[PDB]
Design an enzyme around this catalytic site. Structure first.
Site, short mmCIF file in Angstrom:
data_model
loop_
_atom_site.label_atom_id
_atom_site.label_comp_id
_atom_site.label_asym_id
_atom_site.label_seq_id
_atom_site.Cartn_x
_atom_site.Cartn_y
_atom_site.Cartn_z
N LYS A 105 81.53 27.96 77.92
CA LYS A 105 80.55 27.83 76.83
C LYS A 105 79.16 28.00 77.41
CE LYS A 105 80.40 27.21 72.38
NZ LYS A 105 81.12 28.47 72.12
N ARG A 157 59.66 19.37 75.73
CA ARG A 157 60.45 20.31 74.91
C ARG A 157 61.13 21.38 75.79
NH1 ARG A 157 55.06 21.35 74.13
NH2 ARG A 157 54.39 23.37 74.96
N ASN A 158 60.56 21.65 76.99
CA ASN A 158 61.09 22.63 77.93
C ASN A 158 61.88 22.00 79.08
OD1 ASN A 158 60.08 24.90 76.45
ND2 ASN A 158 58.07 24.49 77.32
N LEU A 176 71.57 28.27 67.17
CA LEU A 176 71.16 26.91 67.52
C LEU A 176 69.66 26.66 67.24
CD1 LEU A 176 73.03 26.64 70.98
CD2 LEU A 176 73.87 25.78 68.78
N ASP A 186 62.51 27.02 80.91
CA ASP A 186 61.54 27.89 80.20
C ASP A 186 60.22 28.12 80.95
OD1 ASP A 186 60.64 29.55 78.12
OD2 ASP A 186 60.78 28.01 76.55
N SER A 238 65.58 33.90 69.44
CA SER A 238 66.62 33.04 68.89
C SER A 238 67.53 32.51 70.00
CB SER A 238 67.48 33.81 67.89
OG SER A 238 66.70 34.31 66.81
N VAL A 239 68.06 31.30 69.81
CA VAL A 239 69.02 30.69 70.72
C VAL A 239 70.35 30.59 69.98
CG1 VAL A 239 69.54 28.82 72.36
CG2 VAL A 239 67.17 29.52 72.00
N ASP A 256 54.49 26.38 81.58
CA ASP A 256 54.83 25.79 80.27
C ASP A 256 55.63 24.47 80.40
OD1 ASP A 256 54.71 25.83 77.42
OD2 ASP A 256 56.47 27.14 77.21
N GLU A 258 65.78 29.19 66.00
CA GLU A 258 65.07 30.45 65.76
C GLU A 258 63.56 30.29 65.98
OE1 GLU A 258 66.45 32.18 61.96
OE2 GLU A 258 67.58 33.68 63.10
N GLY A 259 63.09 30.77 67.12
CA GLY A 259 61.68 30.71 67.51
C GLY A 259 60.85 31.84 66.93
N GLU A 260 59.54 31.86 67.28
CA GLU A 260 58.58 32.86 66.81
C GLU A 260 58.92 34.28 67.28
#
Ligand SMILES: C[C@@H]1CN(c2cnc(Nc3cc(F)c(OCC4CC4)c(F)c3)nc2NC2CCOCC2)CCN1
Length: 268
Positions: A48, A153-154, A26, A167, A33-34, A149, A28-30
């Site tokens: 799910k 976005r979080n 879903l 997050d 991954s999700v 944070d 791919e971060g630094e």
């Protein structure tokens, strides 16, 4: 005891790897991954889920942190379902989270400005988003937990359109946290004010025309985020109170949440 409470939380957080199926990526971060996934529950049915993937001390710290997060019980706070530690050919920690079709709030705000995405968000719904975040943050500060944070976005959107904090970045960090490196719940309040601004602007990046390297000096001179175009003066006053120089003068999340509910109730 303190030890007893930690040993309890620790026992509940781990999920057997075989009770989980990893699917499609879903995001791919630094440093992770999700992935979408399936979790087999104790009632025989599969649910799910979303799986976020990420040295014994670091793993133990991760397990302790995850165990604390799973203990959060509030409708405006993301409920961590559990964790899995997979092993490489190096440990690979995996955090099991709810699957939320509407995704993160930031993306949702941006999509709403395009014809194929969700409909134009009315003022009542934007304020309801702020109320939900304030509700989740009020719960977290009251149990003395620092987010660190907080941003659009979080924040995640549930299927019933309830927003929940998740997050637990320079343009979201308080004036005192950029200098002295110190962080309080009042620093989370500052980040909340910026998040309120992201919602009101329907997803604009904070401080247009101001570079990230010149942020500390910009704030030090008394400059703050400008009032968005069709933003109510009362709403701007609420978000401006979040950016008071002295952290002690900033309102608590509890004060902010009631100010927001009152303003929302006054809307036709
Ligand atoms: C079919 C797709 C599925 N997708 C999706 C469905 N379900 C979750 N669940 C979920 C995922 C997480 F990574 C979580 O950690 C907190 C993150 C804000 C930082 C979390 F609490 C819940 N995430 C989804 N996407 C995210 C992928 C990574 O970037 C953000 C959107 C929505 C878009 N449509």
């Amino acid at each position: 005891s303190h030890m007893e409470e930690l040993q309890n939380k620790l026992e509940d957080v781990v999920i057997d790897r075989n009770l989980l199926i990893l699917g499609r990526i879903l995001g791919e971060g630094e440093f992770g991954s999700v992935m979408e996934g399936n979790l087999k529950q104790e009632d025989g049915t599969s649910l799910k889920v979303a799986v976020k993937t990420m040295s014994q001390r670091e793993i133990e710290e991760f397990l302790s942190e995850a165990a604390c997060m799973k203990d959060f019980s509030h409708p405006n706070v993301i409920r961590l379902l559990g964790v899995c530690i997979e092993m490489s050919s190096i440990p690979k920690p995996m955090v099991i989270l709810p699957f939320m079709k509407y995704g993160d709030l930031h993306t949702y705000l941006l999509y709403s400005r395009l014809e194929t995405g969700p409909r134009h968000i009315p003022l009542q719904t934007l304020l309801r988003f702020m109320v939900d975040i304030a509700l989740g943050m009020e719960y977290l500060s009251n149990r003395n937990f620092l987010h660190r944070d907080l941003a659009a976005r979080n924040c995640m959107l549930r299927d019933d359109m309830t927003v929940c904090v998740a997050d637990f970045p320079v343009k979201w960090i308080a004036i005192e946290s950029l200098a002295d490196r110190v962080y309080t719940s009042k620093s989370d309040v500052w980040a909340f004010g910026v998040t309120m601004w992201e919602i009101a602007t329907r997803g604009m990046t904070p401080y247009p025309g101001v570079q990230n390297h010149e942020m500390y000096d910009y704030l030090l001179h008394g400059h703050r985020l400008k009032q968005p175009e069709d933003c109510l003066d009362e709403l701007y006053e609420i978000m401006y109170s979040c950016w008071r120089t002295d952290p002690l003068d900033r309102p608590t999340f509890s004060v902010l949440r009631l100010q927001l509910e009152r303003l929302l109730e006054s809307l036709p």
